Every structure is written in structure tokens, then in C-alpha cells.
Amino acid sequence: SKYKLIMLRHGEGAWNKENRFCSWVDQKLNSEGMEEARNCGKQLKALNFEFDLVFTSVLNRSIHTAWLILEELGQEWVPVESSWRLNERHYGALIGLNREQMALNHGEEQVRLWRRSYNVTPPPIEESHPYYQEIYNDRRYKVCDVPLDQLPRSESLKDVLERLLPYWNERIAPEVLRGKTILISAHGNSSRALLKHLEGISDEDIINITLPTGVPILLELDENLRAVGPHQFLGDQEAIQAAIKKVEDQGKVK
Template sequence: MSKYKLFLLRHGEGAWNKENRFCSWVDQKLSENGVVEAQECGRLLKENGYQLDQVFTSILSRSIHTAWLVLEAMGHEWVPVTKSWRLNERHYGALIGLNRAEMALNHGEEQVKLWRRSYDITPPPIHESHPYYAEIYNDRRYSTCDVPKEELPKTESLKEVLDRLLPYWNDVIVPVIKSGQTVLISAHGNSCRALLKHLEAISETDIVNVTLPTGVPVLLELDEDLRPVKPRQLLGDQAKIQAAIKKVEDQGKVNAQNK
């Protein structure tokens, strides 16, 4: 029997999602379409009678703005929003800023899929000579983290995302859920996938095939041990959701278009 409801949300489309580039820890804003996706998500939740008690986001603007727009559309502007770097997108290291389709052309689609979707394969690390290194590590937001700046990752596998996310999940988010509050986590494709792997006990092999489109809320109904009592539900028009999933999956292919 369901005792708790948890919503996971990959932020609305960002500027670099639109350009098919690895965004990662670079702080990109939502695209015009991303703003619409977040607003539609909020309206959908409201129309279905859902109410939120607390929201958690990463410290990246696209995650935060998505949460704000969802809450505004629901008339929930007063709901507390808590931010943590531990919900950040996966750190893609030296791949940051690169176009996925061009990478597939240069390195092969299978290699790009492994970098993007596998559980324990880590991309090459970012170095100080990288064009976005200073933009990331000189950003004042990273002086607010609960680890020294020099200990922040320079690249991550999905496993490492889960490793840095789990302490925050267990220590901060779980007590809120177990107090009976309905939580929305407005985060990123990989931080949401990592959490799904943990909650649903998805195998290292099967997690490769879990795809979350932008702006689509995922409802998890959990028992008292925070284990799912039914399959996850991607809320909204199912035909549109499947088309959006295919679009995400095609981003790492040579013929992917920058739409």
C-alpha cells in the first residue's frame, strides 16, 4: 500500500539541451521551450490535484528556475525550496560543451552512449586548460558546498553521482518524506536516474536504458521503507512523452539534429 508520494523532475529544456551539447556543471538557463515545459508541468500537477510540501533542487539555475515555474503554476510559491550541489547534474569532465552528435561521429555512437548512459564508466576529467574550467570552479556557488572546492569532482560516472547524492538523500530528504510531506526533486537527467536506480533497485545493466525527458514529472508511490509499490508513472500525454524519450536517446547518434 502506498504511504508516500515523491515526484522526480528533470528540469525543462536548457539552452545546451537544444544545441545537443554536454552541459553538466556549466550554468545554463532554460530555453523558451524549457520555460513552457516547466509551466505545463506545474499546471498538470495542479489539474491532477497534487500538492507539494517541499522542493529540493541542485544549485544550477535550470533546476532552480524549473522549480520556481512549477510552483508558480501550482499557486505554491510559498513552498520551501532547498538547494544542494549534491543534486547537480553528472560532471561530464572534458566532454563539457561538446556536441553529442559530433562526438558520435568522432568516437562512435557506442562510446558516446557508454559515456552518457553507463553506470560505472567515467569520461576523461576536465583540466585547467578546458574552456569552461574557470567558469565552473571560480563560480562562488561552489564555495558554499559541504566539501572543499578542491575536493569537488573533475569528472563522474553515474555510480559516483549516486555516491555523492545518497548522503543528502538519506540525511536530508528522507526525513522530510517520512514526516508525511510530499516532495518534488527538481534536478537533472542523471541525478534523477541515479536516484531511480537506488529506489527501484535497477541493475547496472538496465539503468543504461532508463531515459527521462525534460519537464516530465515522474511520480513514485512508496511504502514505509521508501520502496516503490507500483511502477513509476511519467505523467502527461504518453505519446508526447515517448517521442521526447526517443529524442533524448537519439542525441548521441551521428545524424542527430540540433533542434
């Protein structure tokens, strides 16, 4: 293809073992998630990736993932830019809740709908929510490209794409078209949104895409920045399939 792009979601964060929706809560990587980022960097080094620019969200776990990757590559000097527009989907009032408990109380199908639907919007987070203040009082959201009171209080995946697309179009895509090799260090839902756009995945088919943590995703793009074929997970496909199943199973009872 004319261009190649790498994107990924970070490895396990500090709420993964507790199986809680994390979203805009700024949890750090845990020890396993740090190792996943190192493994990504080693895999990218083995394939000779030489990045020219890295894009991340403003959540520290995506930034630390980038930094660990760049250290493994010996590319710490490569410019990094961060934007809330690559943040994980805002899960609203579901932030902090246990996915398995939700499946037990409401049905696995209900949790699957909440997690993977394109159109369904979670209930908005309210000021009484235990995690409201630590999100909206953070300085990183006082200096972003929209006013604090305009930031979402919950998002469908469609909403994520709507706020990610301007950043892709205005900032990332022009660099790809210059022939620069780009790394996008983001999150499960923000990566799914961008894949939906670049691959032309239907609203119905995007529900069945679950991305494994800490696995580089190669996208080959044509002159119009449309995918030439489906995304490719770089690694051992058996391990990758088990990693996908692991994410799916977070929403299953027992």
C-alpha cells in the same frame, strides 16, 4: 502506496539546440524549457499536488524550473532547498562537446556508453578546458558542504549516486517519512541515480533508462522508502515516448 514523491528533470536549456553536453555549466533554460516547466506545473495542478518542500540542484535551470512550477501551482511560498548533491552528472572534459559530432567521430555506441553507463567515468576536466574557471570559481561551490578542492572533476553515474545518497538519506528521506509531499527538481543523471536506488534497478538495467525532459515522474514508496512499482511519467504516454526518443537521438548521427 504509503508515500508519493515527484521528481523531474528540467526542460531544454540554452545548449540543447546546439546538442552540447552541459553538465555543471550553469546555462539557463530557453523559452521552450520555461514552457516545459509551466506545463509540468499545470499537470501537477490538475492532479491536486500540494507540495510541502522542494529540493533542487544549485544549477539555476533546476531552480527556475521549480519556481515556474510553484507559480503555476500558486505555491510560491513553499520552501525550496538547493544542493550541489542534486547537480547533473559531471561530464568532465566532455563538457561543451557536441554529442552528434562525438558519435560521428567515435561511434554512436561510444557516445551511448559515455552517456548511459553506470560505471564509466569521463576524463576529468582540466584547467585548460574552456569551462573550468567558470565552474570552480563560482561562489556557490565555495559554500557547499565539502571543500572546493574536494568537488568532482568528472563522475560516473555510480559516482553521482554516491554523492546524492547522503543528501537523500539525511535531508529528503526524513521529510518523506513525515508524510510531506516533496518535489525534486533535478537533472537527467541525478534523477536516474535516485530512481536506481529507490527502485532497486540493476547496474545493467539502468543503462536503458532515459528520462524525458520536463515530465513529472511519480514514485510511490512503501514504509521503507522502497518503490512499490516502477516510476510513472505523468502525461500522455505517446508524447512522453517521443520525448524519450528525442533524448536518445541526441547521440545518433543525422
